[PDB]
Amino acid sequence: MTRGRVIQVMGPVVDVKFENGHLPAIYNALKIQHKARNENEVDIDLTLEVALHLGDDTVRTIAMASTDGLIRGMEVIDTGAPISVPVGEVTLGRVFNVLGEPIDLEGDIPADARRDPIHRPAPKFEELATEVEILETGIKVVDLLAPYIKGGKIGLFGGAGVGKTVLIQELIHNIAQEHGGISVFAGVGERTREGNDLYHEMKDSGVISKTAMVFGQMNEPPGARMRVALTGLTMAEYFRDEQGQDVLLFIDNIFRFTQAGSEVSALLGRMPSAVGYQPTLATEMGQLQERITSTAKGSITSIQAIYVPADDYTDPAPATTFSHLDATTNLERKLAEMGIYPAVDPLASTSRALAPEIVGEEHYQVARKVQQTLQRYKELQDIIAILGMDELSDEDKLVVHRARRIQFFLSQNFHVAEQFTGQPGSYVPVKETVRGFKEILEGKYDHLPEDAFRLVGRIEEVVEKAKAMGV
C-alpha cells in the first residue's frame, strides 16, 4: 500500500515522489498502469528504472518506452526488485524484448518460471581462468595476422558501410554450427530488416533450438537501447554458471549502448565531458564488459562489432572500448574503395595469441615478414605519388612488386556474399594460408599478373585463374 506520484516529465526521464521512508533502491523497476477516465486521456502501460535520489522523497527514473500521454499526478507502483528476465531451457529458440517478453507470437512464458535480475556484480579475482587456445575461422587475413582466442573477447571496428554486418554473418555461419554448445545473439541499435533476415537465415540453416535472441533496435527509445545487452548477458550467464557449458555471445553494435547512455545523461542533469559525452563513460563500459569472462566453471566467447563515428578512431567511445579486447579487427574505407574485401587493415589489427609458442614458429616468421613488407610499401606511397616509380632502387621496386601481390591475396570470396557477386565462396585452413604466403614471399609467383590474386581462396586457384587469363 505504498504509492508514488508523477511530478515531472522531461522526455525519456520521469520524476516520482514517494512517502517518507519508503523510497525504492537504485536500479529498481516501477510500473504505471492507467485506464482513460474521459475523452481527453489515453491508456498507459509503462515501466521505469530508478536512477537517482534527489532529496525530498523524490527519485529520478528512466523510461523504457515512450512517455507520450503521461499526466502529472498519475500513481506509480514499486515492484521491489530490478528488471527480472526468464532464464533456462525455456529461452532456447525464442526471440525476446528488453523486458523479457517474447515477440515471436508463439505463446506466453509461464509466470512460475525462474527469473533473474538484470544487474549484478562482476566475478572476483579468485575465480577467473587464464589460458590461450586458438579458434579457427577460415579467413586468411584473420588466421594469419590476428588469430582469435577460444575464450576471450574479439572486436570488429568499422565505420559506416564498410562491412561489419557481412563479416558478422560470415563468422556466424562458419562458427556457430561447429561450436556445438549454446549461443546468444543480442542486437542493439541496428536495422530491423537485418534482424528479420538473420532470423529466417538461422531458421533455415537450423542453428535455432540452441540460440536465444534479444532485440532492441534503431526505433526504440534510449532507455531500451541501454539495457538490452544486459538481458542477453544474463541469459548467457545462466548457462555458464549453472550448467558449466561453453557459450558464444554476439553483440550487433556495442557503440549504441554508450550512445544511448550519452543521450540520457544530458536530461539526467549532468555536466558534459569532452565531445559532449557523459562523465561516466568508462565506468558504464567497464561495468558491462567485466561480466563477460571465463571463470572456473565455464567460458563465454564474445564477438562484438563496434561502430566508429565519422571515421575517427580517436573518439572517446572507440578509444575506451579498445582496452577490453584480446583480438581486434579494424576495417578501413580506403581499402573498401579499392574493392579489397574484407577491408581489414593488416597493420592495426592485433591479437594476444600471436606468439611463437602458441601458433608455432613458421607462422610467426611468415606473419612478421608479411607485415614488414607491407609497412615498407606504406612508407613509399608519397614519393611514388609525386615523383613516380622510375626514381627507385631495384630493392624498392621488388618490395612494391611483392607488396601489391600480398595486398591483393589478403582478400577473399565469402559464402554470404554470393548473392552480390556470384562466386560460391571459399574456406581456407591455417596451414594452407601459411604455405601460400610463404610461396608468395619466395618469389615463386612473381611473373603472374597482379590481378589474378583478387577474390580467391587458395593459391592453386590463383594459378588456375592466371591460366584462364591467357598466361
Partner: protein, 548 residues
C-alpha cells in the same frame, strides 16, 4: 472562484452555487467573489482554479462557430468548459506557461491568438511550449487552452492533388480539405515478425539507376551529392514515371525556396502527375519547429495508404535542413552540443523516421512504403557527421558527381528487385563500365595493344554515351533492356560515337512501329525474347539506318 454576471446576484443564490461547487469539486467550503462586469448580459461565466464555465453571450459567438432545419433552429447552446493557463515567458519561438494541470506530454495547445503549440516539458509548476507558427502575436499574460489530443494530422484521399503545410492546412488557395480521419505524428514502426523481404521493382525511368543501382518497393535508398548536382530533377522524373504503376507519391520540401516549389508543382501538373501526388511544404522563412515536423507529417500521411494494402513512395528533399532546424531548436533550450554543435539525439531524430518504411507481410495486408532521403555535402565530403549518420540507416546510396559515381554508389536489397531480362544484361554493362573507368586512368596518353586500344575504350565510350538522358523523358523498361542488350551483344561498334543518341531515338521509333510482339513478350513474361528474332530485328534496323 470568481463569477462574471450581468447583474449582482442575490447572496442566497451565491451561497447555493458556492455550496454546490464545493460539494462537486471536493472542498468542504467555497466562497465566490462575484464581479459587476456588464458585457456578459447573457448569463454567468465562472472561473475557478484554472477551469472556466461559459455564460450565454459566447453562445452568440458560438452561433458564428455554428456557421455550418435552419441550423436546427440555431441548434442548441450548452455550457462548454475548458482548462486554461497563462503565459509567463515568450521569445525566440519557445513559450512557458502556468496552469494546464491535467495536460499530457506531446499534447496540442491553442493560444488565444489562434496559433497552435506542443507541450514539451511538464515541470513542477511550468509547461514548456513549442510554437508552431508566428510568435509575434503572443505576449506574456495571454491565455492558452488545451485541445485534449496528442499531435496528429488529417489523412485521407481528399489530400490527393493538394499542397499543404505540416499541419494539414491548404496553402494553394483552392478551398478547405474535407478529410474525416487523423493519425498521430509519432507512431511505432512495424515489428520484426511483420515484414518480409523485398521482391518487387520500383522503376525510376533512368537507365543508370535502373541498371546499376536498382531499387525495390519497401527499400530505403539515399541520394547524396553536392549542391548544384540536380537531385530534384531525379526526384521529379521518378515521380513522373509512376503514371501507369499503381503507386501513390508524396513529395516533402524542407527548407527550399517557395518559388522553386511553385515551379516544381507547375512541372508536375503539366505531365498529369497530380492525380496521385501530395505535396507538403515548409519554406526557408518558416519557424524551425515547423521545419522539423514536416517529414513526420509526410510519413503519417503515407502510412494511411500503406496500412490498407497500397504502395507509397515518399521523398524528403533535404534531411540536412531538418537537422539544422533541430540543432537550432535544441540550442535555444540550452542543451549541451556534441560534434559540430549537433545534439546527442541527432541520430535518433533520423533513425526513428526512416524505420517506418517497410515491406509488410501478407498477414498485415501486403502494403509497402519506399523512402528517398536527400543529403547535401560540402566539397564532396562523404565522411562528415550527418552523411555518415544517414549512410548507416539506409539500404544503399547513390553518389552524384559534380553522373552516378559507381565506385561509391551501391544497393543491397536491389538485385532481387530486378526483372530477369535486365538481370541477364546488366552484368556485362557493369564490367564494360569498370573496364573503361580503370583504363582511362592511365591510357590518357599511351599506346596499347589492340585489345586494350579498342575493346577497352570504344565499348566504354559507347556505353557512356548510351547512359546519358534528357530532362522529363523517362524510358520504359522494355526499351531500356533492348538498347542495353544491343550494346552488350555487340552492335554500335561500327557506329560513330557522335550518332549513338540518334541511333537510339530511331531504334525506339522502329520498335514502336514494328516490334509489337517483342515488346508484348517482354511485358508479359519478364524475360528476354528469342535471340534469333532479336538479332533479325536489329539487323533490319541497321540495314535501314543511315550512318553519318
Amino acid at each position: 472562484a470568481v463569477a462574471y454576471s450581468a447583474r449582482p446576484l442575490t447572496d442566497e443564490e451565491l451561497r447555493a452555487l458556492s455550496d454546490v461547487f464545493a460539494q462537486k469539486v471536493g472542498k468542504q467550503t467555497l466562497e465566490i467573489e462575484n464581479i459587476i462586469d456588464p458585457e456578459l448580459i447573457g448569463g454567468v461565466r465562472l472561473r475557478i482554479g484554472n477551469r472556466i464555465y461559459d455564460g450565454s453571450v459566447s453562445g452568440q459567438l458560438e452561433r458564428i462557430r455554428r456557421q455550418l432545419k435552419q441550423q436546427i433552429e440555431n441548434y442548441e447552446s450548452q455550457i462548454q468548459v475548458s482548462d486554461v493557463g497563462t503565459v509567463i515567458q515568450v521569445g525566440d519561438g519557445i513559450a512557458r506557461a502556468h496552469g494546464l494541470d491535467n495536460v499530457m506530454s506531446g499534447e496540442l495547445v491553442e493560444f488565444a491568438n489562434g496559433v497552435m503549440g506542443m507541450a514539451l516539458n511538464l515541470e513542477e509548476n511550468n509547461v514548456g511550449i513549442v510554437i508552431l507558427g508566428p510568435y509575434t502575436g503572443i505576449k506574456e499574460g495571454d491565455e492558452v487552452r488545451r485541445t485534449g489530443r496528442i499531435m496528429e494530422v488529417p489523412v485521407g484521399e481528399a489530400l490527393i492533388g493538394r499542397v499543404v503545410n505540416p499541419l494539414g492546412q491548404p496553402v494553394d488557395g483552392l478551398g478547405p480539405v474535407e478529410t474525416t480521419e487523423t493519425r498521430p505524428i509519432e507512431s511505432p514502426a512495424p515489428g520484426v515478425m511483420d515484414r518480409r523481404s523485398v521482391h518487387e521493382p520500383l522503376q525510376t525511368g533512368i537507365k543508370a539507376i535502373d541498371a546499376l543501382v536498382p531499387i525495390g518497393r519497401g527499400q530505403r535508398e539515399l541520394i547524396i551529392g553536392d549542391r548544384q548536382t540536380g537531385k530534384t530533377s531525379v526526384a521529379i522524373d521518378t515521380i513522373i514515371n509512376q503514371k501507369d504503376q499503381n503507386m501513390i507519391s508524396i513529395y516533402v520540401a524542407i527548407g527550399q525556396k517557395e518559388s522553386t516549389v511553385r515551379t516544381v508543382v507547375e512541372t508536375l501538373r503539366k505531365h498529369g502527375a497530380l492525380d496521385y501526388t501530395i505535396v507538403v511544404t515548409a519554406s526557408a522563412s518558416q519557424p524551425a519547429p515547423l521545419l522539423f515536423l514536416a517529414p513526420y507529417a509526410g510519413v503519417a500521411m503515407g502510412e494511411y495508404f500503406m496500412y490498407k494494402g497500397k504502395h507509397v513512395l515518399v521523398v524528403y528533399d533535404d534531411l540536412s535542413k531538418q537537422a539544422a532546424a533541430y540543432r537550432e531548436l535544441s540550442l535555444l533550450l540550452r542543451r549541451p552540443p556534441g560534434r559540430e554543435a549537433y545534439p546527442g539525439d541527432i541520430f535518433y531524430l533520423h533513425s526513428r523516421l526512416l524505420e517506418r518504411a517497410a515491406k509488410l507481410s501478407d498477414a498485415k495486408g501486403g502494403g509497402s512504403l519506399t523512402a528517398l532521403p536527400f543529403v547535401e555535402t560540402q566539397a564532396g565530403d562523404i565522411s562528415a557527421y550527418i552523411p555518415t549518420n544517414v549512410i548507416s540507416i539506409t539500404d544503399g546510396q547513390i553518389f552524384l558527381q559534380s553522373a552516378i559515381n559507381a565506385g561509391l554508389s551501391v544497393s543491397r536489397v536491389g538485385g532481387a528487385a530486378q526483372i530477369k531480362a535486365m538481370k541477364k544484361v546488366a552484368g556485362t554493362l557493369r564490367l564494360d563500365l569498370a573496364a573503361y573507368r580503370e583504363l582511362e586512368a592511365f591510357a590518357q596518353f599511351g599506346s596499347d595493344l589492340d585489345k586494350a586500344t579498342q575493346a577497352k575504350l570504344a565499348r566504354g565510350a559507347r556505353t557512356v554515351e548510351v547512359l546519358k538522358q534528357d530532362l522529363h523523358q523517362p524510358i520504359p523498361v522494355e526499351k531500356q533492356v533492348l538498347i542495353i542488350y544491343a550494346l552488350t551483344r555487340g552492335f554500335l561498334d561500327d557506329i560513330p560515337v557522335e550518332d549513338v543518341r540518334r541511333f537510339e531515338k530511331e531504334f525506339y521509333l522502329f520498335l514502336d512501329q514494328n516490334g509489337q510482339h517483342l515488346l508484348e513478350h517482354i511485358r508479359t513474361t519478364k524475360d528476354l525474347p528469342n535471340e534469333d528474332d532479336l538479332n533479325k530485328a536489329i539487323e533490319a534496323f541497321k540495314k535501314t539506318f543511315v550512318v553519318s
